[PDB]
């Protein structure tokens, strides 16, 4: 028996409703039926680690569906940092991804898969008529991040200068914020935040209230 109840007890998942926890648990169990977590270079992942990884994968698609993760069959997990291709992660960053700090490698990688589900362009599958307005708000968010970096420096800035430059990277980083530290996102980028709420069919800030 996978320790699903104990798996849920991590900060990034702490604000899910009881129905959301049940729904996430089931999707994660389905994930582990359909996909392999391949721990490399002697890394050993316990059932609790595996359950938590599966849940992190499923969080961004909780309301979209597990089929949104059909662009990969396996996840490769190295102990540490260095198309239909496997998602590559490392255990050091995954452990950080359990916190509600704004960093989440799993969500980052999922965002990239949602983006390219198509070229990696910072635009996931949205209506054709919304693409211009999405790109407008994304690129404004990017310029806003560059202005910050120009003013206070890379270290003091929230986001790395790569997210200010590559729209795909921006999408992926803001997705990390969306799920892990929405207070860094909602008040700063209200228009883009609204589009992400509509795309992901989740409101992580409303969640904290309830
Ligand atoms: Cl949170």
Coordinates of N, CA and C and ligand atoms in Angstrom, one line a residue:
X1 N 0.8 -1.2 0.0 CA 0.0 0.0 0.0 C 0.9 1.3 0.0
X2 N 0.7 2.1 -1.0 CA 1.4 3.4 -1.1 C 0.9 4.3 0.0
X3 N 1.8 5.1 0.7 CA 1.4 5.9 1.8 C 0.8 7.3 1.4
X4 N -0.4 7.2 0.7 CA -0.9 8.4 0.0 C -1.2 9.5 1.0
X5 N -1.8 9.2 2.2 CA -2.2 10.2 3.2 C -0.9 11.0 3.7
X6 N 0.1 10.2 4.0 CA 1.4 10.8 4.4 C 2.0 11.6 3.3
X7 N 1.9 11.1 2.1 CA 2.5 11.8 0.9 C 1.9 13.2 0.7
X8 N 0.6 13.4 1.0 CA -0.1 14.7 0.9 C 0.5 15.7 1.8
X9 N 1.1 15.3 3.0 CA 1.5 16.2 4.0 C 2.8 17.0 3.7
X10 N 2.8 17.7 2.6 CA 4.0 18.6 2.3 C 3.4 20.0 2.0
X11 N 4.2 21.0 2.3 CA 3.7 22.4 2.1 C 3.1 22.8 0.8
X12 N 3.6 22.4 -0.3 CA 3.0 22.7 -1.6 C 1.6 22.2 -1.9
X13 N 1.2 21.2 -1.1 CA -0.1 20.5 -1.2 C -1.0 20.8 0.0
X14 N -0.6 21.7 0.8 CA -1.2 21.8 2.2 C -2.6 22.5 2.1
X15 N -2.8 23.3 1.0 CA -4.0 24.1 0.9 C -5.1 23.4 0.0
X16 N -4.9 22.2 -0.4 CA -5.9 21.5 -1.2 C -7.1 21.1 -0.4
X17 N -8.3 21.2 -0.9 CA -9.5 20.8 -0.3 C -9.5 19.2 -0.2
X18 N -10.3 18.7 0.7 CA -10.4 17.3 0.9 C -10.8 16.6 -0.5
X19 N -11.7 17.1 -1.3 CA -12.0 16.6 -2.6 C -10.8 16.6 -3.5
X20 N -10.1 17.7 -3.5 CA -8.9 17.9 -4.3 C -7.8 16.9 -3.9
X21 N -7.6 16.6 -2.6 CA -6.6 15.6 -2.2 C -7.0 14.2 -2.7
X22 N -8.3 13.9 -2.6 CA -8.8 12.6 -3.1 C -8.6 12.4 -4.6
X23 N -8.9 13.5 -5.3 CA -8.8 13.5 -6.7 C -7.3 13.4 -7.2
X24 N -6.5 14.2 -6.5 CA -5.0 14.2 -6.8 C -4.4 12.8 -6.5
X25 N -4.8 12.2 -5.4 CA -4.3 10.9 -5.0 C -4.7 9.8 -6.1
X26 N -5.9 9.9 -6.6 CA -6.3 8.9 -7.6 C -5.5 9.1 -8.9
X27 N -5.4 10.4 -9.4 CA -4.7 10.7 -10.6 C -3.2 10.3 -10.4
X28 N -2.6 10.5 -9.2 CA -1.2 10.1 -9.0 C -1.0 8.6 -9.0
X29 N -2.0 7.8 -8.5 CA -2.0 6.4 -8.6 C -2.1 5.9 -10.1
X30 N -2.9 6.6 -10.9 CA -3.0 6.3 -12.3 C -1.7 6.7 -13.0
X31 N -1.1 7.8 -12.6 CA 0.2 8.2 -13.2 C 1.2 7.0 -13.0
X32 N 1.3 6.5 -11.7 CA 2.3 5.5 -11.4 C 1.9 4.2 -12.2
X33 N 0.6 4.0 -12.5 CA 0.3 2.8 -13.3 C 0.8 3.0 -14.8
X34 N 0.8 4.2 -15.3 CA 1.0 4.4 -16.7 C 2.4 4.9 -17.0
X35 N 3.2 5.4 -16.0 CA 4.5 5.9 -16.3 C 5.5 5.3 -15.3
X36 N 6.7 5.2 -15.7 CA 7.8 4.8 -14.7 C 8.6 5.9 -14.2
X37 N 8.9 5.9 -12.9 CA 10.0 6.7 -12.3 C 11.2 5.9 -12.3
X38 N 12.2 6.3 -13.0 CA 13.5 5.6 -13.1 C 14.6 6.4 -12.4
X39 N 14.9 5.9 -11.2 CA 15.9 6.4 -10.3 C 17.2 5.9 -10.8
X40 N 18.2 6.8 -11.0 CA 19.5 6.5 -11.6 C 20.7 6.7 -10.7
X41 N 21.8 6.1 -11.1 CA 23.1 6.2 -10.4 C 23.0 5.8 -8.9
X42 N 22.2 4.7 -8.7 CA 22.1 4.2 -7.3 C 21.1 4.8 -6.4
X43 N 20.4 5.9 -6.9 CA 19.4 6.6 -6.1 C 18.3 5.6 -5.8
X44 N 17.9 5.6 -4.5 CA 16.7 4.8 -4.1 C 15.6 5.7 -3.6
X45 N 14.4 5.5 -4.3 CA 13.2 6.3 -3.9 C 12.3 5.4 -3.2
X46 N 11.9 5.8 -2.0 CA 10.9 5.0 -1.2 C 9.5 5.2 -1.8
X47 N 8.5 4.3 -1.5 CA 7.2 4.5 -1.9 C 6.6 6.0 -1.6
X48 N 7.0 6.5 -0.4 CA 6.6 7.9 -0.1 C 7.1 8.9 -1.1
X49 N 8.4 8.8 -1.5 CA 9.0 9.7 -2.5 C 8.3 9.6 -3.8
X50 N 8.1 8.4 -4.3 CA 7.4 8.1 -5.5 C 6.0 8.6 -5.5
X51 N 5.2 8.4 -4.5 CA 3.9 9.0 -4.3 C 3.9 10.5 -4.4
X52 N 4.9 11.1 -3.7 CA 5.0 12.6 -3.8 C 5.4 13.1 -5.2
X53 N 6.3 12.4 -5.8 CA 6.7 12.8 -7.2 C 5.4 12.7 -8.1
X54 N 4.7 11.6 -8.1 CA 3.5 11.4 -8.9 C 2.5 12.5 -8.6
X55 N 2.3 12.9 -7.3 CA 1.4 14.0 -7.0 C 1.8 15.4 -7.6
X56 N 3.1 15.6 -7.5 CA 3.6 16.9 -8.1 C 3.4 16.9 -9.6
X57 N 3.5 15.8 -10.3 CA 3.3 15.8 -11.7 C 1.8 16.1 -12.1
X58 N 0.9 15.6 -11.2 CA -0.5 15.6 -11.4 C -1.1 17.0 -11.0
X59 N -0.4 17.7 -10.1 CA -1.0 19.0 -9.6 C -1.3 20.0 -10.7
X60 N -0.4 20.2 -11.6 CA -0.8 21.2 -12.7 C -1.9 20.7 -13.7
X61 N -2.1 19.4 -13.8 CA -3.2 18.9 -14.6 C -4.4 18.4 -13.8
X62 N -4.4 18.7 -12.5 CA -5.5 18.2 -11.6 C -6.9 18.5 -12.2
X63 N -7.1 19.6 -12.9 CA -8.3 19.9 -13.5 C -8.3 19.9 -15.1
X64 N -7.1 19.6 -15.6 CA -7.0 19.4 -17.1 C -7.2 17.9 -17.5
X65 N -6.6 17.0 -16.7 CA -6.7 15.6 -17.0 C -5.3 15.0 -17.2
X66 N -5.1 13.7 -16.9 CA -3.8 13.0 -17.0 C -3.3 12.9 -18.4
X67 N -4.2 12.9 -19.4 CA -3.9 12.9 -20.8 C -3.1 14.1 -21.2
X68 N -3.1 15.2 -20.4 CA -2.2 16.3 -20.7 C -0.7 16.0 -20.5
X69 N -0.5 14.9 -19.8 CA 0.9 14.4 -19.6 C 1.3 13.2 -20.6
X70 N 0.5 13.1 -21.7 CA 0.7 12.0 -22.6 C 2.0 12.2 -23.5
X71 N 2.6 13.3 -23.5 CA 3.8 13.5 -24.2 C 5.1 12.9 -23.6
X72 N 5.0 12.0 -22.6 CA 6.1 11.3 -22.0 C 5.6 10.0 -21.4
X73 N 6.5 9.0 -21.4 CA 6.2 7.7 -20.8 C 6.9 7.4 -19.5
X74 N 8.1 8.1 -19.3 CA 9.0 7.8 -18.2 C 9.5 9.2 -17.6
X75 N 9.9 9.1 -16.4 CA 10.7 10.2 -15.7 C 12.0 9.6 -15.2
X76 N 13.1 10.2 -15.6 CA 14.5 9.9 -15.3 C 14.8 10.8 -14.1
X77 N 15.3 10.2 -13.0 CA 15.7 10.9 -11.8 C 17.1 10.7 -11.3
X78 N 18.0 11.7 -11.6 CA 19.3 11.6 -11.1 C 19.4 12.0 -9.7
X79 N 20.5 11.6 -8.9 CA 20.6 12.1 -7.5 C 20.7 13.6 -7.4
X80 N 21.3 14.3 -8.4 CA 21.7 15.7 -8.2 C 21.7 16.4 -9.6
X81 N 21.7 17.7 -9.5 CA 21.7 18.5 -10.8 C 23.1 18.3 -11.6
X82 N 23.1 18.6 -12.9 CA 24.3 18.5 -13.7 C 25.1 19.8 -13.6
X83 N 10.3 16.4 -26.9 CA 9.3 15.8 -27.8 C 8.4 14.8 -27.0
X84 N 8.5 13.5 -27.4 CA 8.0 12.4 -26.5 C 9.0 12.0 -25.5
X85 N 10.0 12.8 -25.3 CA 11.2 12.5 -24.5 C 10.9 12.4 -23.1
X86 N 11.6 11.6 -22.3 CA 11.3 11.5 -20.9 C 11.5 12.8 -20.2
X87 N 10.8 13.0 -19.1 CA 11.1 14.2 -18.2 C 12.3 13.8 -17.4
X88 N 13.2 14.7 -17.2 CA 14.5 14.5 -16.5 C 14.4 15.4 -15.2
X89 N 14.6 14.8 -14.1 CA 14.6 15.5 -12.8 C 15.8 15.1 -12.0
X90 N 16.0 15.8 -10.9 CA 17.0 15.3 -9.9 C 16.4 15.3 -8.5
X91 N 16.8 14.4 -7.7 CA 16.3 14.3 -6.4 C 16.5 15.5 -5.5
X92 N 17.7 16.2 -5.6 CA 17.9 17.4 -4.8 C 16.8 18.4 -5.0
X93 N 16.5 18.7 -6.3 CA 15.5 19.7 -6.6 C 14.1 19.3 -6.3
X94 N 13.9 18.0 -6.4 CA 12.5 17.5 -6.1 C 12.2 17.7 -4.6
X95 N 13.1 17.4 -3.7 CA 12.9 17.7 -2.3 C 12.6 19.1 -2.0
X96 N 13.3 20.1 -2.6 CA 12.9 21.5 -2.6 C 11.5 21.7 -3.1
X97 N 11.1 21.0 -4.1 CA 9.8 21.2 -4.7 C 8.6 20.8 -3.8
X98 N 8.9 20.3 -2.6 CA 7.8 20.0 -1.6 C 7.4 21.2 -0.8
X99 N 8.3 22.1 -0.7 CA 8.0 23.4 -0.1 C 7.1 24.3 -0.9
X100 N 6.6 25.4 -0.2 CA 5.8 26.4 -0.9 C 6.7 27.7 -0.9
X101 N 7.8 27.5 -1.6 CA 8.9 28.5 -1.8 C 8.9 29.3 -3.1
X102 N 8.2 28.8 -4.1 CA 8.3 29.4 -5.5 C 9.1 28.7 -6.5
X103 N 9.8 27.7 -6.0 CA 10.7 26.8 -6.8 C 10.0 25.4 -6.9
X104 N 9.8 24.9 -8.1 CA 9.2 23.6 -8.3 C 9.6 23.1 -9.6
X105 N 10.6 22.2 -9.6 CA 11.2 21.6 -10.8 C 10.2 20.8 -11.5
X106 N 9.4 20.0 -10.8 CA 8.4 19.2 -11.4 C 7.4 20.0 -12.2
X107 N 6.8 21.0 -11.6 CA 5.9 21.9 -12.2 C 6.6 22.6 -13.4
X108 N 7.8 23.0 -13.2 CA 8.6 23.6 -14.3 C 8.6 22.7 -15.6
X109 N 8.9 21.4 -15.3 CA 9.0 20.5 -16.4 C 7.7 20.2 -17.0
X110 N 6.7 20.1 -16.2 CA 5.3 19.9 -16.7 C 4.9 21.1 -17.6
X111 N 5.2 22.3 -17.1 CA 4.8 23.5 -17.9 C 5.4 23.4 -19.3
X112 N 6.7 23.0 -19.4 CA 7.3 22.8 -20.7 C 6.6 21.8 -21.6
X113 N 6.1 20.7 -21.0 CA 5.3 19.7 -21.7 C 4.0 20.3 -22.2
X114 N 3.4 21.1 -21.3 CA 2.1 21.7 -21.7 C 2.3 22.7 -22.9
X115 N 3.4 23.4 -22.9 CA 3.8 24.4 -23.8 C 3.9 23.8 -25.2
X116 N 4.7 22.7 -25.2 CA 5.1 22.0 -26.5 C 4.1 20.9 -26.9
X117 N 3.0 20.7 -26.1 CA 1.9 19.9 -26.5 C 1.2 20.5 -27.7
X118 N 3.6 21.3 -31.1 CA 3.8 22.7 -31.1 C 5.2 23.1 -30.6
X119 N 5.6 24.3 -31.0 CA 6.9 24.8 -30.5 C 6.8 25.3 -29.1
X120 N 7.9 25.2 -28.3 CA 8.0 25.8 -27.0 C 8.1 27.3 -27.2
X121 N 7.0 28.0 -26.9 CA 6.8 29.4 -27.2 C 6.2 30.2 -26.0
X122 N 6.1 29.5 -24.8 CA 5.4 30.2 -23.7 C 3.9 30.3 -23.8
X123 N 3.3 29.6 -24.8 CA 1.9 29.5 -25.0 C 1.4 28.1 -25.0
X124 N 0.7 27.6 -24.0 CA 0.1 26.3 -24.1 C -1.2 26.3 -25.0
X125 N -1.9 25.2 -25.0 CA -3.0 25.0 -25.8 C -4.2 25.9 -25.3
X126 N -4.4 27.0 -25.9 CA -5.5 27.9 -25.7 C -6.2 28.2 -27.0
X127 N -7.4 28.8 -27.0 CA -8.1 29.2 -28.2 C -7.2 30.1 -29.1
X128 N -7.4 30.0 -30.4 CA -6.6 30.8 -31.4 C -6.8 32.3 -31.2
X129 N -8.0 32.7 -30.8 CA -8.3 34.0 -30.6 C -7.8 34.7 -29.3
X130 N -7.2 33.9 -28.4 CA -6.6 34.4 -27.2 C -5.1 34.4 -27.3
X131 N -4.5 33.9 -28.3 CA -3.1 33.8 -28.5 C -2.4 35.2 -28.5
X132 N -2.9 36.1 -29.3 CA -2.4 37.4 -29.4 C -2.4 38.1 -28.0
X133 N -3.5 38.0 -27.3 CA -3.6 38.6 -25.9 C -2.8 37.9 -24.9
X134 N -2.6 36.6 -25.0 CA -1.7 35.9 -24.1 C -0.3 36.3 -24.3
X135 N 0.2 36.3 -25.5 CA 1.5 36.7 -25.9 C 1.8 38.2 -25.5
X136 N 0.8 39.0 -25.6 CA 0.9 40.4 -25.2 C 1.2 40.5 -23.7
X137 N 0.4 39.8 -22.9 CA 0.6 39.8 -21.4 C 1.8 39.1 -21.0
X138 N 2.2 38.1 -21.7 CA 3.4 37.3 -21.3 C 4.7 38.2 -21.6
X139 N 4.7 38.8 -22.7 CA 5.8 39.6 -23.1 C 5.9 40.9 -22.3
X140 N 4.8 41.5 -21.8 CA 4.8 42.6 -20.9 C 5.3 42.1 -19.5
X141 N 5.0 40.9 -19.1 CA 5.5 40.3 -17.8 C 7.0 40.2 -17.9
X142 N 7.5 39.7 -19.1 CA 8.9 39.6 -19.4 C 9.6 40.9 -19.3
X143 N 9.1 41.9 -20.0 CA 9.8 43.2 -19.9 C 9.8 43.8 -18.5
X144 N 8.8 43.5 -17.8 CA 8.6 43.9 -16.4 C 9.7 43.3 -15.5
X145 N 10.0 42.0 -15.8 CA 11.1 41.3 -15.1 C 12.4 41.8 -15.5
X146 N 12.6 42.2 -16.8 CA 13.9 42.7 -17.2 C 14.1 44.1 -16.6
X147 N 13.1 44.9 -16.5 CA 13.2 46.2 -15.9 C 13.6 46.1 -14.4
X148 N 13.1 45.1 -13.7 CA 13.5 44.8 -12.4 C 15.0 44.5 -12.3
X149 N 15.4 43.5 -13.1 CA 16.8 43.1 -13.2 C 17.7 44.2 -13.4
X150 N 17.3 45.1 -14.4 CA 18.1 46.3 -14.7 C 18.2 47.3 -13.6
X151 N 17.2 47.3 -12.7 CA 17.2 48.2 -11.6 C 17.9 47.7 -10.4
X152 N 17.6 46.5 -9.9 CA 18.1 46.0 -8.6 C 19.1 44.9 -8.8
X153 N 19.3 44.3 -9.9 CA 20.3 43.3 -10.2 C 19.7 41.9 -10.2
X154 N 20.4 41.0 -10.8 CA 19.9 39.6 -10.8 C 19.7 38.9 -9.5
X155 N 20.6 39.1 -8.6 CA 20.5 38.5 -7.3 C 19.3 38.9 -6.5
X156 N 19.1 40.2 -6.4 CA 18.0 40.8 -5.6 C 16.6 40.6 -6.4
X157 N 16.6 40.4 -7.7 CA 15.4 40.2 -8.4 C 14.8 38.9 -8.1
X158 N 13.5 38.8 -8.2 CA 12.7 37.5 -8.0 C 13.4 36.5 -9.0
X159 N 13.2 36.8 -10.3 CA 13.4 35.8 -11.4 C 14.6 36.0 -12.2
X160 N 15.3 34.9 -12.5 CA 16.5 34.8 -13.4 C 16.2 35.5 -14.8
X161 N 17.3 36.1 -15.3 CA 17.2 36.8 -16.6 C 16.9 35.9 -17.8
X162 N 16.9 34.6 -17.6 CA 16.5 33.7 -18.7 C 15.0 33.8 -18.9
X163 N 14.2 33.8 -17.8 CA 12.7 34.0 -17.8 C 12.3 35.4 -18.4
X164 N 13.2 36.4 -18.3 CA 12.9 37.7 -18.9 C 13.2 37.6 -20.4
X165 N 13.9 36.6 -20.9 CA 14.3 36.5 -22.3 C 13.6 35.5 -23.1
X166 N 13.4 34.3 -22.6 CA 12.8 33.2 -23.3 C 11.3 33.0 -22.8
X167 N 10.3 33.2 -23.8 CA 8.9 33.1 -23.3 C 8.6 31.8 -22.7
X168 N 9.2 30.7 -23.2 CA 9.0 29.4 -22.8 C 9.4 29.3 -21.3
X169 N 10.6 29.8 -21.1 CA 11.1 29.8 -19.7 C 10.2 30.7 -18.8
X170 N 9.7 31.8 -19.3 CA 8.8 32.6 -18.5 C 7.5 31.9 -18.1
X171 N 7.0 31.2 -19.0 CA 5.8 30.4 -18.8 C 6.0 29.4 -17.7
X172 N 7.2 28.7 -17.8 CA 7.5 27.7 -16.9 C 7.8 28.1 -15.5
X173 N 8.5 29.2 -15.4 CA 8.8 29.9 -14.1 C 7.5 30.4 -13.4
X174 N 6.7 31.2 -14.1 CA 5.5 31.7 -13.6 C 4.5 30.6 -13.2
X175 N 4.6 29.4 -13.9 CA 3.8 28.2 -13.5 C 4.3 27.7 -12.1
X176 N 5.6 27.7 -11.9 CA 6.2 27.4 -10.6 C 5.6 28.3 -9.6
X177 N 5.6 29.6 -9.8 CA 5.0 30.6 -8.9 C 3.5 30.3 -8.7
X178 N 2.8 30.0 -9.7 CA 1.4 29.9 -9.7 C 1.0 28.8 -8.7
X179 N 1.7 27.7 -8.7 CA 1.4 26.6 -7.8 C 2.1 26.7 -6.4
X180 N 3.3 27.3 -6.4 CA 4.2 27.3 -5.2 C 4.2 28.6 -4.4
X181 N 4.1 29.7 -5.1 CA 4.2 31.0 -4.4 C 3.3 32.0 -5.2
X182 N 2.0 31.8 -5.2 CA 1.1 32.7 -6.0 C 1.1 34.2 -5.6
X183 N 1.5 34.4 -4.4 CA 1.6 35.8 -3.9 C 2.7 36.6 -4.6
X184 N 3.7 35.9 -5.2 CA 4.7 36.5 -6.0 C 4.2 36.8 -7.4
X185 N 3.0 36.3 -7.8 CA 2.5 36.3 -9.2 C 1.2 37.2 -9.3
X186 N 0.1 36.8 -8.5 CA -1.2 37.4 -8.6 C -1.1 38.9 -8.5
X187 N -0.5 39.4 -7.4 CA -0.5 40.9 -7.3 C 0.3 41.7 -8.3
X188 N 1.3 41.0 -8.9 CA 2.3 41.7 -9.8 C 1.8 41.6 -11.2
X189 N 1.3 40.5 -11.7 CA 0.8 40.3 -13.0 C -0.7 40.0 -13.1
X190 N -1.6 40.9 -12.8 CA -3.0 40.5 -12.6 C -3.7 40.0 -13.9
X191 N -3.3 40.4 -15.0 CA -3.9 40.0 -16.3 C -3.5 38.6 -16.7
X192 N -2.2 38.4 -16.7 CA -1.6 37.1 -16.9 C -2.0 36.1 -15.8
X193 N -2.1 36.5 -14.6 CA -2.6 35.6 -13.5 C -4.0 35.1 -13.9
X194 N -4.8 36.0 -14.4 CA -6.1 35.6 -14.8 C -6.1 34.6 -15.9
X195 N -5.3 34.8 -16.9 CA -5.2 33.8 -18.0 C -4.7 32.5 -17.5
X196 N -3.7 32.5 -16.6 CA -3.2 31.2 -16.0 C -4.3 30.5 -15.2
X197 N -5.1 31.2 -14.4 CA -6.3 30.6 -13.7 C -7.2 30.0 -14.7
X198 N -7.5 30.6 -15.8 CA -8.4 30.1 -16.8 C -7.8 28.9 -17.5
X199 N -6.5 28.9 -17.9 CA -5.8 27.8 -18.5 C -5.7 26.6 -17.6
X200 N -5.2 26.8 -16.4 CA -5.0 25.7 -15.4 C -6.3 25.2 -14.8
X201 N -7.4 26.1 -14.8 CA -8.7 25.8 -14.2 C -8.6 25.6 -12.7
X202 N -7.7 26.3 -12.2 CA -7.4 26.4 -10.7 C -7.1 27.8 -10.3
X203 N -7.4 28.1 -9.1 CA -7.1 29.4 -8.5 C -6.4 29.1 -7.1
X204 N -5.1 29.0 -7.1 CA -4.3 28.7 -5.9 C -4.4 29.7 -4.8
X205 N -4.7 31.0 -5.0 CA -4.9 32.0 -4.0 C -6.3 31.8 -3.3
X206 N -7.3 31.6 -4.1 CA -8.6 31.4 -3.5 C -8.5 30.2 -2.6
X207 N -7.8 29.2 -3.0 CA -7.5 28.0 -2.3 C -7.0 28.2 -0.8
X208 N -6.0 29.1 -0.7 CA -5.5 29.5 0.6 C -6.6 30.1 1.6
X209 N -7.5 30.9 1.0 CA -8.6 31.4 1.8 C -9.5 30.3 2.4
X210 N -10.0 29.4 1.5 CA -10.9 28.4 1.8 C -10.3 27.3 2.7
Ligands
LIG1 CL1 0.7 27.0 -2.0

